[model samples]
Target: AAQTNAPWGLARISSTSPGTSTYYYDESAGQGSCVYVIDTGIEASHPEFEGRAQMVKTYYYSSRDGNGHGTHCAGTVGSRTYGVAKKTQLFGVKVLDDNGSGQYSTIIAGMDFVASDKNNRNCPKGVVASLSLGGGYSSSVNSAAARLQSSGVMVAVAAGNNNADARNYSPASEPSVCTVGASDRYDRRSSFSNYGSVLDIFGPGTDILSTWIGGSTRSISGTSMATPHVAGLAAYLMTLGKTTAASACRYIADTANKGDLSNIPFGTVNLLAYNNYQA
Candidate 1:
């Protein structure tokens, strides 16, 4: 299975340096693990997912995946075509509408639902929640995410697109969840991505191509796009039998590549996401 001229984001991750032009990963690394994509609805019928992706719930009105953000993120997480893990179950929890926006109450409810679903043993273990949206600072949403992760759902959040300190936003500011920043193929921080010490790791975010709505594809940018890559890796790296969110994030950090990125802000971890692959 040689992928000639593979996607830069996928190829960059499996090796220590850039321009590798190939993606190397264990085909079954994330088998049985689940990733909850809490954003706009995912187009569950997309060809990239085969039968592994589905929209389980919706918090917004109208239909699902109109904005295409959530579907793209879901693709980055574990789609058969554009994923990092490739084998994890993708559960789309639609908190945002086609406009890619939602109220804090709606987002919080989605978080609670996922947490309770896992706590109640409705889903398999080794769960990771990919939250690709953020808003103004809110203690309620922050605590909700914290509690959700404490309930054993590893959460990965976007550091926001404002290019400011990531700690200024809720959920991203939540200390327990992994706050993911954005980097380009050259290993420099994407200019629009938020920064600060609170960030757990960086992932490829600029012009990332993934599954869109209506069985198509799209390439986009932002920390929103970067967060799910970490979410996928968490699903790939999470160990069974009671691994906490904090431990899961730490394990990812330990598995991450260090000292290769440039323009990292003061106090931010210079680690980049990897899928336990070697050159």
Candidate 2:
């Protein structure tokens, strides 16, 4: 993929961290890796996608994006300008309706579809499922995520935007998923971000600019925005042959910047930091 201006989320991970002068710009870019954005849907014609993103399956209505949420999340996961893995193959799975509302069963079905090789023929090497939608706790959803992870699909989900403990949510509280929280440009946790032990990592989510529905662009905020950064990171790691969910999560937790977040439970234990340098 051609180089482009760094998105703040990417910059924070690849460049802004202390003790890392060499940014991971153009190093991995998630070439040949696939990410499933199971949300509203994607704008297949979005220019920022550079013709790489596609609507692979739909669990509800049309696969086209009526709400801009899915497009924005997809852009952050793979867009050439506003993404972490600029060259990742983006697969859209529309579980949420136009109102961004869906049942837990629908989300589980989406996960099942992405995890099955017979169903996800386009993503044979497996995928990193980036889900930014969530609701009250559900055992079925957690089990589905765990099963998908056991099948080697890396799952990353938003920790929710309720500013409460993430343990009350479904996939976020699920042990197998990488539960990502929201952070601001200054590396502080966003005011709306859910925290506590269930949170796995943090990413730039405030005022994030990315591709929208109908070939447009917009800025939005939420743990929903932060989830894709971790998902995209997992996709980039896949390009480096870290394809399994466990190994990818281990590498991310090991290599992430521990000082980026402060005064949180786990004591910066899972805060994300970028270090793609070989030296």
Candidate 3:
């Protein structure tokens, strides 16, 4: 297959934190802002959720019931202190369904649904679209993500969970998409995170404790968990008045810690170091 050569954008903050104190000591949950989670359905009834979830639109492109992965990811992105961007609204796009798989068309359709003014009645102007799914790089998906970017929607995606060097499909490799990698609570890169020039930022993904299916709490790991942390941050930044993808990406990347590229394959990425550099 022919690889897509999309134009890369400037650096931005990776969606690594879930609007929590660890990432933002003084930042508050996204109270009035709205964000769309383009993944599995959210855990609509979890207590930490507390009638907090308002599903603007729910699409089961793949499955009907809530997928455990999407619900867990949604909890991390929008749940209260357990969440980083609690003040933001969440819209569920169930592209991957219960089995944790879907076709490329289904994924693109979900992206279109999020960007469509006809779909999001409350905040059609814009909302952060969070994605915790990725696959082997694909050109068609990249093109679709680009259209979403051109339409003014911020697409956030997981870097991938392969623990390999390559990136995931559609949004991750696409220039317009915000690619996120996972890091440990201590702020070090996880042994499994895929690294490359395409990786823009890192967020906490290791041993993430969040709301799970059947009213339970579980510790999960993967770049899938890390992607939403940044998505929640995007919502907070949007609340702070970031209206364009360029501004959002630049702020996070320029401010995040840059690593020593001398020994690493794709250079370094650390939010703390980047924060210090900005200082």
Residue by residue across 165-231, what tens digits does model 3's lDDT show?
Answer: 5455446778667788776645557678777677777766777877777777777888888787777
Clashes of 2: 2
- Alpha carbon lDDT of each predicted model: 0.84, 0.80, 0.63
What's the CA error at residue 235 for candidate 3, in Å? Answer: 0.5
Off by over 4 Å in 3: 1-28, 56-65, 117-119, 124-126, 242-246, 260-264, 268-279
Candidate 2 vs candidate 3, lDDT winner: 2
User: Could you give the candidate ranking by TM-score, starting with the highest?
Assistant: 1, 2, 3
lDDT of 2 by residue, 144-254 (tens): 988888887888989999988889998988977788888887667888988878777787788888889878888999999999988988888777775456677767877
Q: Which is the better candidate, 2 or 3, if ranked by TM-score?
A: 2
Highest lDDT: give the candidate number: 1
Model 1 Cα lDDT, one tens digit per residue, 37-92:
99999888887898988777887665478989999999999988688878788898
Q: For model 2, what is the alpha-carbon lDDT of residue 278?
A: 47
For model 2, the stretches where C-alpha displacement exceeds 4 angstroms are: 1-5, 16-23, 117-126, 263-270
Task: Give the lowest summed-lDDT range of ten residues in model 1.
Answer: 237-246
Off by over 4 Å in 1: 1-4, 119-125, 239-246
The TM-score between candidate 1 and the true structure equals 0.94
User: After TM-score superposition, what is the CA distance of residue 276 in candidate 1 from its true location, in Å?
Assistant: 3.1
